[PDB]
Structure 1
Amino acid sequence: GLKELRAVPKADIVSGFEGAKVCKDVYPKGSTKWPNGSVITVGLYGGTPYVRSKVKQYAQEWSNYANITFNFVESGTPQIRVTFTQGAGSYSYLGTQALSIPSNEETMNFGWFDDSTSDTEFSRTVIHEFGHALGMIHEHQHPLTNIPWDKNKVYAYYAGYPNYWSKKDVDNNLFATYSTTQTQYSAYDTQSIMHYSISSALTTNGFSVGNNSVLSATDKQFIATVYPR
């Protein structure tokens, strides 16, 4: 199979955020569009056969609309390298930033899948992370109220693997970024698979915001414009 990746220190994975389904922005230590028509190699590291089959299943949905294909392989150094490290959050580098990640590290992680995971949850989270793998950013419609973060909790969550974000890192990279609307679309698309989920595990009111679980009309149109036939 694939050569194993360097080990995650499971002590750096922060405990006590059970059922926190957070997409983490991640940045390489230091254009993201793939060449059009690319066939991108993907390797899966760990996970059960069931979980790995679901990832394949939903990732490849993007190719219905984009002129990009994912070739799931078990040899060499795949271009996208997917782990299943529990509790680390889910994430992907953006687009061709994957190609900047050392070969012994992952480029994508799914932090909460198991063999009881719903089809909708696989669809939502897999398509979403693969959206970032194609270069899409979060859609975030900033609410009029502002977000009621439990700042203590937010600091604790983002302090560990993979970000290792200090308090100032969190204030600049998280609160600042998500204090205003963020979009890649002309009109906002409440339906986008790329919407940024705000977990109630990180807020104070029980406030949460969720993700749509399938590709929107706008998602389908945008990605075909980026990667046309």
Structure 2
Amino acid sequence: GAVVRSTKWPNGSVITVGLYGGTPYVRSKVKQYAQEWSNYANITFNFVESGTPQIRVTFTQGAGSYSYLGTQALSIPSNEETMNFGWFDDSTSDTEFSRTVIHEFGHALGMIHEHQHPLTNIPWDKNKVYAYYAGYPNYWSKKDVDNNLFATYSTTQTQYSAYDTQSIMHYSISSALTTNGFSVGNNSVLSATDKQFIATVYPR
């Protein structure tokens, strides 16, 4: 796990969260798996239907799933979302809710992508990575690949644990895209390192 230091919330802080749209099913599932973080981190997510929430969540279809890093949400205008879930519906399984709700709420806590960990040096087969992401279903450009995959953060701007391949913040990496046989599977729950690291970041 790795957190951008400048995006960290004050420890023990209660973060207001607003849900805008979504079915009762999707909404309850978002809250259910978001509050999973509070079992290990000294951070509370307060889901509200009142006031001006610090975290604002939408469900705009096709817009992808994302979130701003921690307190970056403060810079965002009140008429915009800080977090969006792009593919949920009333047929979404618990495994999928767990995999991406926890992950985007990990971003909301200040955590980056684990494949961009400051201690890592993942053996990308760069040409094959470019080739795959250039086509369906991502259609990414060179700037997209270089910034979202290849680039890593620095140890100076981040508070980090050891590189964790099982982290909820680690994207799947196929052995077909590496030069090493190295591969990362599908992580859909909080890893042991996750629970430990987010505890050191927001300790009790």
TM-score in terms of structure 1 length: 0.68
Residues 141 and 177 of structure 1, relative CA distance in 2, 3 Å threshold: closer
* 8 A Cα contact 1:39 1:69, kept in partner: yes
- What are the ranges of 5 or more consecutive residues in structure 2 without an aligned counterpart? 1-5
Please list the CA deviations of residues 110-149 of structure 1 after superposition, one character each: whole Å capped at 9, or x if unmatched: 1111111110110111111101100111111799999999
CA–CA separation in structure 1 for the residues paired with 2:162 and 2:90: 37
CA–CA separation in structure 2 for the residues paired with 1:145 and 1:37: 30
Please list the CA deviations of residues 160-203 of structure 1 after superposition, one character each: whole Å capped at 9, or x if unmatched: 99999975465445554599999964432221111124599999
Residues 47 and 73 of structure 1, relative CA distance in 2, 3 Å threshold: same
| Equivalent in the alignment of 1:13 | none
How far 1:212 moved relative to its partner?
Answer: 1.0
CA–CA separation in structure 2 for the residues paired with 1:181 and 1:161: 36
Residues 139 and 74 of structure 1, relative CA distance in 2, 3 Å threshold: same
Residues 185 and 226 of structure 1, relative CA distance in 2, 3 Å threshold: closer
Within the candidate set 104, 120, 125, 1:129 is matched to: 104
Q: What is the aligned-residue identity percentage?
A: 100
* 8 A Cα contact 1:194 1:211, kept in partner: no
Task: Report the number of matched residues.
Answer: 199
* 8 A Cα contact 2:41 2:202, kept in partner: yes
Mean CA deviation greater in 105-114 or 169-178: 169-178
Please list the CA deviations of residues 40-93 of structure 1 after superposition, one character each: whole Å capped at 9, or x if unmatched: 100011110100000000000100011110110111211000011111111100
CA–CA separation in structure 2 for the residues paired with 1:181 and 1:117: 39
Runs of 4+ in 1 over 2 A off after TM superposition: 141-188, 196-211
* 8 A Cα contact 2:117 2:152, kept in partner: no
Higher RCO (CA < 8 A, seq sep 6+): 2
- Find the residue that maps to 1:59 and give its secondary structure: helix
* 8 A Cα contact 1:42 1:73, kept in partner: yes
* 8 A Cα contact 2:161 2:197, kept in partner: no
User: Superposed, which structure 2 residues align to 1:199-218 within 5 Å?
Assistant: 210-218=185-193
* 8 A Cα contact 2:115 2:149, kept in partner: no
| Equivalent in the alignment of 1:167 | 142
* 8 A Cα contact 1:82 1:106, kept in partner: yes
Please list the CA deviations of residues 201-228 of structure 1 after superposition, one character each: whole Å capped at 9, or x if unmatched: 9999999954311111111111111111
* 8 A Cα contact 1:141 1:181, kept in partner: no
CA–CA separation in structure 1 for the residues paired with 2:62 and 2:129: 15
Residues 36 and 56 of structure 1, relative CA distance in 2, 3 Å threshold: same
Residues 180 and 65 of structure 1, relative CA distance in 2, 3 Å threshold: closer
| Equivalent in the alignment of 1:3 | none
Select the structure that is richer in strand: 2
Residues 172 and 118 of structure 1, relative CA distance in 2, 3 Å threshold: closer
User: Superposed, which structure 2 residues align to 1:216-227 within 5 Å?
Assistant: 216-227=191-202
Residues 144 and 185 of structure 1, relative CA distance in 2, 3 Å threshold: closer
Residues 51 and 224 of structure 1, relative CA distance in 2, 3 Å threshold: same
CA–CA separation in structure 1 for the residues paired with 2:131 and 2:51: 37
